[PDB]
Every structure is written in C-alpha cells, then in structure tokens.
Symmetry: D2
C-alpha cells in the first residue's frame, strides 16, 4: 500500500512531471501524475469553493471548483475506491508553496461519510463542518506549517504580516478516523466541501491546495514540498 487519493487544485504547471501546460484541477490516485485533469483558472484574491463527491455504487469520483461569477471547472475519474483505500482512513487538506508563493487559506470545510448497508438508516456515519477555525483546533491534526490565524481561518501554509512565504508545507486532518468501508457494507459514500483563498502580490504563484484521503497514521512525506503538495515523496 500507502495510499493517497486526493483532489488537487494545481496552481503551477510542472510539464516535466506530467502537469498540463496551464493551471489546472486534477484527480490523484496514488501518484502526483493526475489520473484526470481539467483546465482551471486561479483568480488571485477571491474566495473559491470546492465540492467533492464519490459514491461506491456509481464509482465516479468527481470534483468541481468554483469562483463566484459562474466561472467553474469540473473533473471526474472513474475508479473503485474500495480496492484502493483501506477500510479506515483520515481525511484532510494540505498545501505547499515553492520558490513562488501564495496564501493557501481555508475559510471553511465540510465532510460527510456514510456507511449504510441494509435495513436502511445508518450503520455508521460522520459529518463535520467548520465555518470558523478555533485558535486551538483540538479536533484537527495540524502538520507542518499549518496553523489557524486570528481571523478564524486555517492557514495551511505560512503567512507573515499579510505576506505568504516560500517553501512552506502544511496539512490538516480531521482528528477522528473514518470508516470508509466494511465487508458487510452495501453502499459507501463521502462528500467534501471547503472554501479557499489563494492570493499573492506576484502573478506567478505556486503550488496549490489539495483535499486528501489517506491511512490513519499518514504524515507529511519527505520530498513533499513545492509541487508534491505535501502528498507524495516522489513524482512517480
């Protein structure tokens, strides 16, 4: 194993590691080389939204990221996550800056998980929403440079005096592990939404924000930085 399924909001195109030659939105399955991508357009300074969906029966993993004004992108891949993921996982959001930098601010985050089966209702389920983040988020595993600011926002990557910083990595995970699958399960599904703010003084920006599902114990790998988005140790 050692596993990651992520949805990447990729803000710098490294054509050498199979990024398309433009800012994009992608689906990652065990590799940084996105299994599917669509054209995205960052809009420096604006609050964006990301909606992610998967359903064990339809087996389509789809995401959509939107800025107000109608300008939005969708991508979906098409994969049986029962076979990829472990039964228990932790969900999270992570982000990185490179030589080029940006704010990777999360203003809000929601997530639903259902393990229904039979005789209906719910064998197991989880829901959390955060619309403000506590100064001391006791239900989040903060990793690397991930902090909450005095605004009740989650700064995945470092920010000094209104300014982003180079070579930063932050991840935040939901404290509780999530039972994404069981042998006796009929359906499994999850839905995740988060709002983000990517801003910088420069027009050149790096490297992106991603939402990820991983193993319970998962921590920031080794060559995680820049364009590995805190997710993978190599570009394979």
């Amino acid at each position: 194993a050692d596993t990651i399924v992520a949805v990447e909001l990729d803000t710098y195109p490294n054509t050498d590691i199979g990024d398309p030659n433009y800012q994009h939105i992608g689906i990652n399955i065990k590799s940084i080389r996105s299994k599917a991508t669509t054209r995205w357009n960052v809009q420096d300074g604006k609050v964006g939204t990301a909606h992610i969906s998967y359903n064990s029966v339809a087996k389509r993993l789809s995401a959509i990221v939107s800025y107000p004004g109608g300008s939005s992108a969708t991508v979906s891949y098409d994969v049986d996550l029962n076979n990829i993921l472990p039964e228990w996982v932790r969900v999270g959001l992570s982000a990185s800056t490179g030589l080029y930098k940006e704010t990777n601010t999360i203003l809000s985050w929601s997530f639903t998980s259902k393990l229904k089966t039979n005789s209906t209702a719910d064998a197991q389920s989880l829901h959390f929403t955060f619309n403000q983040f506590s100064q001391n988020p006791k239900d989040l595993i903060l990793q690397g440079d991930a902090s909450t600011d005095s605004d009740g926002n989650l700064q995945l990557t470092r920010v000094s005096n209104g300014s982003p910083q180079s070579n930063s990595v932050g991840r935040a995970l939901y404290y509780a592990p999530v039972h994404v699958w069981d042998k006796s399960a009929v359906v499994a599904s999850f839905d995740a939404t988060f709002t983000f703010l990517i801003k910088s003084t420069d027009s050149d920006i790096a490297d992106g924000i991603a939402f990820f599902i991983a193993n319970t114990d998962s921590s920031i790998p080794h060559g995680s930085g820049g364009r590995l988005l805190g997710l993978f140790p190599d570009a394979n």
Copy 2:
C-alpha cells in the same frame, strides 16, 4: 407530457416492450423501456432496501437493491439530468399489479436534495425521512389505491385481509415541490432510500415498485396500470 425519471424494481418480464426476460431493476429516462437494466431476484416476503444516487458533476444516476444476507444488484446510467428535468419537481413512489399480484409495501422512505452554490451554505436543501407512516399522511399526496395501514406501512397497491389485489395502481408523492436546479446552481445532488416488502401466495407475481421524479403537477396517466407501473401513458 409528464416528464418521468424513474428507477424501477420490475418483478415481471414484459419482453414485448424491451423488458429483459427476467426480474430486474432499471433506470428509465422518459420511457418504460429502461435505458439500463440489471438482473435482480425478488425474495418473496422479505424486507429489501433500495438506494438511489445522483450528483450533477458526476452526471451518473445509479441505484442499488439489496436483501439481508448478501444478495444485491446495481445499475447506473450516465445522463445530464439538467437537460431532462424541469427546474421544479416532486418525488414519489409508485407500484402496480396486473392479473398477477404482489404486496407493494413501503416500510420506510428517505430523501435528500441539495442545490449547491459558492459555499458550504446550501442554496437550497430538503431532507425528509419516514420510518413509519402516519395513518393520515398530510405531507404525502396519495394517488390511486395508495394508502397507509394499521401498522404505519405504505400500501401502494391494495391489500384485503392479508392477500394483495389484481389490477391495482398506487403512487405517493411528497407534498413539497423539490428545487432540482437553479441558474446560480454549481452542483445539484439527490439521494433516496426505501425499504420494501413484496409478498404473494402465488410464485408468479407482477408488476413492481418504482421511485420517480416528475413535474410537480403529475398524476397517474391514463392506462398506465400493471406493466406500465403508473408512470407512462403508452409503452413507447
């Protein structure tokens, strides 16, 4: 006409109109001839469970039908429902018997609809669940022989002192119109669950149960008894 999107639990093969020559489940888009079908075996006098899923980014409608033990069957179909469905709908369950008969008993019904936008705040959402039924469902629109018995179960087709009745048709729509898409719509989704109980003295049975989405004003069309499941005028 009536614009019906339906998920059928078809208990009797009408091969003359494209039914596979076996009990099955189907995704129907504007026609009784399922746009997708999957073999399904009825367990007489047992409690089944059905789960229905749609997400407007995935654009795939899927459905699962399952009995305790393991027995289950899935079906899905790729369709942009935005292009099939009107801004406003009502949802419901329908059922019918022919010369051959069955109990078409609902023991529980759940529904979720989210019209999404640029945040974790849903533009519009609706969620109802019924785990037993009121003797006078003022929130249900009962059509045909649909009714609720002295147990709090919804009997869509008739029942006289135990035994089911022939040539019967029953529908129950939820009272509130459901907002299935706006303009400001970034994502629209819905999910539906119901537990059922199909029972007869005779081994050969007809005709089935269905979940449907229709124009709000929809009623049972003329001559849609038996093999048309109370959804369609003709078999075109």
Copy 3:
C-alpha cells in the same frame, strides 16, 4: 379560529395592547399578548439572526436574536405544545408595517423537525434550508404583499425602489405540512433559523417579523395588518 404559536421580533411598542415600552422579542401563545418578552434593540440596516428551539421533553420554547458585534437577546417560555397545536401544522414567517414602515427582508431560513421513537431511526422528520430564494418559490405558500426580489431575498412586506411601504402585510409558509407530534411518538422537536434585515430612513419603525407554527390552512386573518403582525384577528 387560527391556532397560532409564534416568536415575534416586535419593532414598535404598542403599550395599549400589552407591549413593553421598548423594542422586544416575544413568545406568543394563541395571542398577540406575549407570554414572555425581553428587551431587544433593533439595529437599522444591519443583518440579524434568530434561533428558535423546542423539544417535547424539555417543554421549553426558547428564542435568541443576535446582530453581528455582540448584542443578543433571549426569551424562553415553559409550555407543552402537545396541548396547544394540532397534530399537523405549517411553519411560516410573517411581517407587517403600520403607519410607520420598515423593510422586513429575509435572506435565509431553515427548519428541522423530528419525531423520535425506539431507535435512531427518526420515526419521521423534515429538514429544509433556504439561503437564496428563487424568483418563484414553488415550495412556499406566499400570502399578502410577500414576494421574492431580484437578489434572491424574500420581502414579506412591500418595498418600492429601495423604499419600504406602509400598511403592508406578508406571510410565507413552507408548502409541506409538518407532523409536529404523533400519539405514538416519544420525543418531538423542532429548530428554526432565519436571517433578517430591518431598514428604514426613519428612526421610528414598525412593526416586526414573526416565525410561526399554525393549523395547516392558516391564512392571513381579517384586519391583522399592523401591531398584529399578520397573525391575529384581534388583540385578545
């Protein structure tokens, strides 16, 4: 007669019918004469929030109303709504203006009701959420001057070209009847939230906004158009 239980956001003190000599919130039971009120200070032009709660075990109906900043006011009244309401009801928001006028604008609304029994299977429940009102809400029964503006706001009372109008009443009820209690139920509970905007160029404003529960066929009673906030025929 119309059976009404309401929570009032009374923006004008009519001391002649039992209003305290100040702007206040109140819990009304079968009467515009509030069973418990608390001092409330309207903030002109500011968006406020109210939260309403009840639970058949606790048998306390409480409300809280807050503006951004700090200012909040709560009121609470002990009552068994089993004895007061019909088994089936409808929930709405109503508003009125008198000689003096104000905008009674709703920007968001949501309602959970649960009927609980021997499970976590809610016996029955309903949940709807509005954050933007479509230009033509088929899920709302609009009465009196109530309509939806081109912003996706709900103007319970008339507003012409930015200016609110006098002698205006509006009500807006959710389409579906709510099952508020069943005899076989064990706990029955509801919660409501809505966000509002009272504005006016005059410092002197009237009359207020209400959230109410009522018999299903409840309509705006005759001559109920000012201090009676579209709820009551008279002042008893």
Copy 4:
C-alpha cells in the same frame, strides 16, 4: 480532577449515597448524587432507547428513556452547562457491575453538536452515528472492559460465554474532541440517542449505564467501580 456531566441509567439503589430507594434515571452534574432523579423500571432482556438533549438558550438538560409502549421515564434539570464544562470536551458511554451483574450492551449510538456563534451555516458542527459497531473501532477510545462483540454490538462490561461478569468497568469515548462552547458563541446545543440491552439471569442486578461529557483527556477514575458508574473517584 475530571469535570463530568452525565445521564445515569441507575439499576441498583445505593441509598447510603443519595440514591432514591428504587431503580431510576438521573442527571449528574460533577457528582454521583444526581441533581434530579426519576423513577425508572428496568425491563430485563429488552432493548431500551435513550434520548438526551440540551440547548444553551433553554439552559435545560432533559433525558428520556423508554421501551416499546408504554412505557417511558423522563428527567430534566435546569443548568447552564457552558459555565460548567470546558470549551472542548469528549462525549462517551460508561457502565459498571458490582457483586451483582448485568450486560450493558450498546446496540446503537448517535450524537450531534452544533456551535452556532454564527448565522446557520454553523461555525462548527459535528454529527456521528453507529447502528453496528465494528469489531475494531478506530474511532472509539475504548477504556474499560469495553470491547465490541461479534454481533456488532458494544459490550461496555465484560461478558463471558453469554454471561455478564462481576466487578467490571468500561467506557467508550468518541475519538474527535467536541467543541461545546466558544467565547464568540451565540447558541450551542447537543443531542444524543443510544439503544441498550440490560440482561441478566440473576433476579438482582447492577449497576447501570451512563452517557457523559467530560474533559478531553478523561479516563477511568480510581474508586469508580460498581456504584460510581466508572465516572467518579468518590461519592461527594
């Protein structure tokens, strides 16, 4: 020491420490001497259901525990719990047996927490349910003789060969901490439901099951066996 709020399903009358001279249900504020108590008759061998509820405006913690008709016992106590509990807490279940014993089997558990210092699009929400417990629950902090059987039920007190043991303590806490209150808070609230099976072959039994919220690091106190329900070190 541990800061503890609990609802006790007390199955043995310890009259030398303030228990009423019968079986009962009770509200515990930082002591096993319940602030309010109500008569409750344990029905041996039967799945009972318990619902707990609180809202920070009402300041009224109510509980209701019952069995298939009638036959239901209720207790409440007015209290500002947000001046009693730490900002962040953990929610859990605990049970104990003495010389006399019983099964304290949990079949289902659900919980909701809402912290709206907001305008409904919660600042912070958490919801979870289990209707079957996994044979290895990564998302429960198991603390006693508390394990989960092969039935998908949670045995809070030890059971050998279908038979309950003497002198057993067990507790299960949800993994994620819960943000019960913040300085910027307008309303907080919570609801829990669980279903339980108290069974024994001995005509006398002990000691009971409890729902509880305590500090995030709470663990089994030291004299907490038997009559102290795994909750308290002494009986003050």
